[PDB]
Design a protein around this ligand. Sequence first.
Ligand SMILES: CC1=C[C@@H](C(=O)NC[C@H]2CC[C@H](C(=N)N)CC2)n2c(=O)n(CC(c3ccccc3)c3ccccc3)c(=O)n2C1
Ligand code: NA
Lengths: 36, 10, 252
Amino acid sequence: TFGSGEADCGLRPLFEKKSLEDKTERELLESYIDGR
Amino acid sequence: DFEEIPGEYL
Amino acid sequence: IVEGSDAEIGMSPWQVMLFRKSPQELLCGASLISDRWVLTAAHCLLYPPWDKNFTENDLLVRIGKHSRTRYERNIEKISMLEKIYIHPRYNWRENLDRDIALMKLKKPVAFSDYIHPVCLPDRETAASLLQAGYKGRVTGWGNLKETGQPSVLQVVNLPIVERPVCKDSTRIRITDNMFCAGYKPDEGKRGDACEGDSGGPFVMKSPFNNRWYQMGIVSWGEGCDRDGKYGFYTHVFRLKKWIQKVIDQFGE
Ligand SMILES: CC1=C[C@@H](C(=O)NC[C@H]2CC[C@H](C(=N)N)CC2)n2c(=O)n(CC(c3ccccc3)c3ccccc3)c(=O)n2C1
Ligand code: NA
């Protein structure tokens, strides 16, 4: 909702939930100087 | 330009 | 979105189409932060200067959408706004400071492969993330060129720009509730949000819990994809307090 949203907030059924990556996610991760 | 919506919506 | 790419299916599940019933046309972008609450730009709803004043009646909400034009038959769900809440100190008269609004659906929306909400940030998310250079992502069904229209929902990843640049790029008075985004011309990389992009989200994926958060709300700018020009976004974090206020006041 709020406080870092809802709960299942921001986990996409179609990527995250099945551990599939979209074609440009990397881009971003590589900017927060490369992810987790 | 928009395709028609289910009237149930209006 | 100017010089962007087509969305992938299920890539942006929180995305919403602000749809005007009559005539039948998209009015903006927007986002599902919950199964009963949508976050847009206050200017998608009120703009006296332009004789804009959407009442709940004038609107329907479309979620699950990928294709702009077509009714997405078994994929999307269409909602009716129950209530609208404009940011009390939203400044339409000047610089669109606090461009933020909430819309509470007449009934709970159902989560799915195509419909699932974005996180709203905490103080520490925002800290680690909204740092110049860090990339975020914008989506819309808006203009493809300052001066076509997409067939499919559009995507574009843009670097957060250092405050000073924001400022020396315009004549408009920027506030702390604002952040700007894009490439510098040095940078030779393109992409802007554009007309009909308002209300959509500027999201970044946390690299800590690798959750997707809405950093921004597409607000304003000058032209679309103009050199030495940036897109300005409402600062969600900055308004989060306003945000639990109304949700825990009359909400889901
Ligand atoms: C309701 C409106 C919302 C919004 C909009 O087009 N929003 C939709 C688009 C705008 C362009 C975008 C972009 N290139 N990223 C992103 C989303 N906005 C503007 O940006 N201007 C233009 C703008 C402007 C005018 C003079 C100098 C620089 C920029 C502006 C901004 C704040 C206050 C007034 C006018 C304006 O007149 N309005 C009125
Ligand atoms: Na540019």
